[PDB]
Amino acid sequence: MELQPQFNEFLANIRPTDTQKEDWKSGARTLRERLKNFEPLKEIVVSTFLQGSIRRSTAIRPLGDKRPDVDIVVVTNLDHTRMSPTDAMDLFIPFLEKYYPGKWETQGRSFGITLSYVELDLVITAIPESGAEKSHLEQLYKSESVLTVNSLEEQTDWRLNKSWTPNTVEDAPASEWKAHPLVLPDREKNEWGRTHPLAQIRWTAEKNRLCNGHYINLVRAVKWWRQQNSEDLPKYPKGYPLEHLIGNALDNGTTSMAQGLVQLMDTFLSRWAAIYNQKSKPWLSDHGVAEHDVMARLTAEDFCSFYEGIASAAEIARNALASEEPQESAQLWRQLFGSKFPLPG
Ligand SMILES: Nc1ncnc2c1ncn2[C@@H]1O[C@H](COP(=O)(O)CP(=O)(O)OP(=O)(O)O)[C@@H](O)[C@H]1O
Numbered sequence: 470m471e472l473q474p475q476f477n478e479f480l481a482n483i484r485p486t487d488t489q490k491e492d493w494k495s496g497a498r499t500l501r502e503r504l505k506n507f508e509p510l511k512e513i514v515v516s517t518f519l520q521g522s523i524r525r526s527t528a529i530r531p532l533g534d535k536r537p538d539v540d541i542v543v544v545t546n547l548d549h550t551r552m553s554p555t556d557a558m559d560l561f562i563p564f565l566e567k568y569y570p571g572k573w574e575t576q577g578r579s580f581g582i583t584l585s586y587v588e589l590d591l592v593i594t595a596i597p598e599s600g601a602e603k604s605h606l607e608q609l610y611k612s613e614s615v616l617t618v619n620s621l622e623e624q625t626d627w628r629l630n631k632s633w634t635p636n637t638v639e640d641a642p643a644s645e646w647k648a649h650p651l652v653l654p655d656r657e658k659n660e661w662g663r664t665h666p667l668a669q670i671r672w673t674a675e676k677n678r679l680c681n682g683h684y685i686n687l688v689r690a691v692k693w694w695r696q697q698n699s700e701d702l703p704k705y706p707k708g709y710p711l712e713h714l715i716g717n718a719l720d721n722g723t724t725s726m727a728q729g730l731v732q733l734m735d736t737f738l739s740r741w742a743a744i745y746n747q748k749s750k751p752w753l754s755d756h757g758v759a760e761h762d763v764m765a766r767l768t769a770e771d772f773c774s775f776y777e778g779i780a781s782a783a784e785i786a787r788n789a790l791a792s793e794e795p796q797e798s799a800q801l802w803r804q805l806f807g808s809k810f811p812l813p814g
Pocket residue numbers: 520521522523527528529538540590666669708709710712755762763764
């Protein structure tokens with residue numbers, strides 16, 4: 470059985486809490502305003518915006534006491550050919566000491582800021598374009614479409630368009646943004662790399678519409694499966710490479726979460742069968758920066774162990790979907806997801 474009310478309750482159980490949500494919305498607004506009014510950075514900071522799994526509504530609630538990771542981009546107008554990633558980051562130390570003393574730390578390519586209930590993950594970026602192109606991009610980064618702190622789940626009317634306004638317009642033509650990534654610090658060395666968070670967000674919103682609202686829920690459900698079965702799965706993939714694998718495997722047109730789960734798992738297994746039999750791993754283009762392999766740091770051994778995990782899970786998911794009794798079907802789904810998936814009343 471599909472058990473759509475049970476899937477809805479399960480999703481409500483694995484979303485971050487309202488306490489966490491209001492903490493990160495207020496934290497993002499406060500950081501943005503403080504940066505806006507900080508005199509040494511006023512002419513440098515273009516935009517401060519929410520990104521990552523939190524923005525795309527693909528984050529799951531942390532277990533126990535833990536604070537969710539909440540990703541923030543600071544867009545600057547710095548010349549990345551004349552200043553290194555650390556030059557740009559150096560600019561923000563006085564600001565952090567003034568407004569977040571004792572609550573911030575450098576974490577390699579980003580700054581961690583400990584709030585009451587969440588952990589901000591701040592990345593400093595720059596716009597590589599110049600002239601009029603740069604001005605047009607800065608206008609996009611200053612628009613409500615970028616500055617909204619509501620997540621995709623809260624505004625299905627969201628589009629990547631400097632003219633979009635919250636409903637109390639489509640995505641802009643791709644030629645205005647698709648080939649225009651930001652630069653950010655590389656993970657382990659003082660060099661600029663490319664990232665296109667806006668394009669990832671837009672791609673996710675569109676995939677979610679193409680899949681009738683089930684995509685971001687399916688991402689969170691599969692993350693929860695991976696967490697619940699972590700003892701039997703490889704450490705990687707997780708986080709964004711896992712999300713990207715799910716978005717790849719899922720077909721357009723999803724009609725329920727049970728159907729979508731079985732479909733995406735079946736498709737994963739068929740699409741990567743040759744790669745698995747070659748003891749390899751796929752090369753998968755990032756939706757933001759096409760020439761980037763989202764799987765670049767994943768080992769072939771981990772991909773193949775994960776493939777074995779998906780094969781085992783797909784058998785369970787098929788049985789749960791095919792089951793004609795609500796209790797038996799829910800028991801099989803709970804074999805996948807654990808006790809946060811409820812039994813029907
Ligand atoms: N291998 C990768 N390829 C492309 N983009 C990536 C990426 N790793 C991270 N990113 C981008 O940077 C954002 C922040 O990354 P992370 O915080 O490390 C994982 P996340 O997607 O936010 O899930 P999580 O923090 O809830 O576990 C990601 O959401 C993604 O937009």
